Each structure stands twice: as C-alpha cells, then as structure tokens.
Design a protein around this ligand. Structure first.
Ligand SMILES: *CCC(=O)Nc1ccc(C(=O)Nc2n[nH]c3c2CN(C(=O)N[C@H](CN(C)C)c2ccccc2)C3(C)C)cc1
Length: 276
C-alpha cells in the first residue's frame, strides 16, 4: 500500500502496469510466477542508469519500476520526428553502455528489441523486460543467425546482432530483416548480408540444424545505409558478422571510433520527445 495508483498504463502477460506517486517521496513510479520471481531476484540485484530500476516488489505480486514516458518503437514509428546522427549515436551509446554492464555481470538479455528500450522524460534510455534474461551460468526479426539455425551453445553475439537490428531500424525507420518464418528470416539475412561460407564461419556445419542455403552475395552496407559514414558502417559491419566469435562485443563497439568522432551524442534533454 506504500503507493496508490493514478493512471492505467497497460495490460499484458504479467499483470497490469499502473502509474503511481509513491506516498512518501512524492516520486512518480510504474507498478507491475517462477518465470517472474527469478526476474524479481535479478533486477533488484543490478543498478545502472541504462537498466530499468526495480525499486520495490511485494502469490499475486506488484513490482515498482521507474516510470518511463516512451520507448524506441514509438520514436521509430513516429513520422513527426527526424533522427539525426547525434540522436542515433546517443541512443546506441546508452543501449551499449547498459548492455556492457549486463555482460560484465555475466547476464544475457536475449530479448533486445526497440519496444524494450524505454526512455524517461530527461532522455535517459533504460533496457526493460528481463523475463527472457539469463546468466551465462528473441522475436524473429532481432534473432541471430545461429539461434535460427539451432545453437544452444551461444553467447553475447545473440544480444549484439539485435543491437545491429535496432541500429538499422534507427537509420531506415523500418525493421531491417522482417521475416515471416524462421527460414524466411535466414533467407532475408543471407540476401541482404550475403550467405556466409565456412571461411566466414569455422564450426558452422557442427550446428544441429545447419542447412545448405542459396549462395547470395548480399547488398553492400553503403547502399543500405547511404547516409552513414565509414565509422558507422564499421560499427554495423562488426555487429552483423556471422561468426559469433568474430562478432563485436558491447565493449569493442563502445571503444569504436564512431562514438569518439563528430557529431557527438545529443544530450538527453535534447533527444526528440514524442506526443501520444
Ligand atoms: C503520451 C503517451 C505515452 O507516452 N504513453 C505511455 C506512458 C508510459 C508508459 C509506461 O508503461 N511506462 C512505464 N514506466 N515504467 C514501466 C513502464 C512500462 N514498463 C514495462 O515493463 N512494460 C513492459 C512492456 N515491454 C514489452 C517493454 C511490460 C508490461 C506489462 C507486462 C509485461 C511487460 C515498466 C514497468 C518498465 C506507457 C505508455
């Protein structure tokens, strides 16, 4: 009861979400089970500016997170907005910084997609929905080629491919590889980026469900991302490498010249806030 609800925010799988002012602090919050009670454990553990804060939780349960004004899917979907190189850079920086933190804490998100990359009123992006997240101990369109094949030994490359997919959608403003089966998703990856050889991939055929695909050459990235410079083409190139050992980590992505080159990232206050 330490909170009292103000506005309905949504329905879904896990309970309903409700906007509230916390009685004591006057701060505004949002208020949400083995598949959820490991999520409750995991999120009260962590603290990062770019990770959703689980503030309280208390079986019929309600889980107080930060309140978030919007998400990247809204921003992507919104025609009233133009994204500038500096908005994109700021968005990918916060995404990757939040990710780097999780992966140094030996956690995979496994459900990166733009509707999970929430934003506050002060332009701070926070990764949300750790219901698929697991310790090292996603929907088709952000899913890595290896996962579509059938790899269960898999790593950070799973989350890194999705970041490429989200990055492309920041640029094109449309899903990059929008497949309508798990095979159509491989068909789409291999016509756009080219069919990987086993020189593009050392132990590929050892996958239980590796399959002999049509040998496409792919579209060059400069044709797809025409407005991107060589520094951002290298970021996109790194994220989309088929070998999950070659594929760039959040850390290698963040030490990439792209984030140190001009134009720099937009401050949160000046990131494009939408209306409903
Ligand atoms: C102007 C219109 C507008 O911006 N509307 C709007 C404002 C705010 C929200 C909102 O839900 N805010 C919010 N604050 N903290 C949270 C949220 C949503 N949320 C979730 O966890 N939501 C997830 C949805 N995933 C797919 C990102 C959810 C919700 C229910 C069940 C499962 C998953 C938290 C609690 C982080 C919405 C619209």
């Amino acid at each position: 009861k330490r909170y009292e609800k103000l506005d309905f925010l949504g329905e879904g799988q896990f309970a309903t979400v409700y906007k509230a002012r916390d009685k004591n602090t006057n701060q505004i919050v949002a208020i949400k089970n083995r598949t959820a009670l490991r999520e409750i454990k995991l999120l009260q553990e962590l603290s990062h500016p770019n990770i959703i804060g689980l503030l309280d939780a208390f079986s019929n349960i309600s889980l107080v997170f930060d309140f978030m004004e919007t998400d990247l899917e809204v921003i992507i979907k919104d025609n009233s907005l133009v994204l500038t190189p500096s908005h994109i850079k700021a968005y990918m920086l916060m995404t990757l910084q939040g990710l780097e933190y999780l992966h140094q804490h030996r956690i995979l998100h496994r459900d990166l997609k733009p509707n999970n990359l929430l934003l506050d009123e002060n332009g701070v992006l926070k990764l949300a929905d750790f219901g698929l997240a697991k310790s090292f101990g996603v929907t088709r369109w952000y899913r890595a080629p290896e996962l579509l094949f059938g790899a269960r030994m898999y790593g950070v490359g799973v989350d890194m491919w999705a970041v490429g997919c989200i990055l492309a959608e920041l640029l094109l403003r449309v899903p990059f590889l929008p497949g309508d089966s798990d095979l159509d998703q491989l068909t789409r990856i291999f016509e756009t980026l080219g069919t990987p050889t086993e020189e593009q991939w050392p132990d590929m055929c050892s996958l239980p469900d590796y399959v002999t695909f049509k040998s496409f050459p792919g579209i060059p990235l400069h044709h797809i991302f025409s407005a991107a410079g060589d520094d951002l083409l290298d970021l996109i190139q790194g994220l989309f490498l088929f070998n999950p050992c070659a594929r760039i980590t959040a850390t290698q992505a963040l030490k990439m010249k792209y984030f140190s080159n001009r134009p720099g990232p937009t401050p949160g206050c000046q990131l494009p806030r939408p209306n409903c």
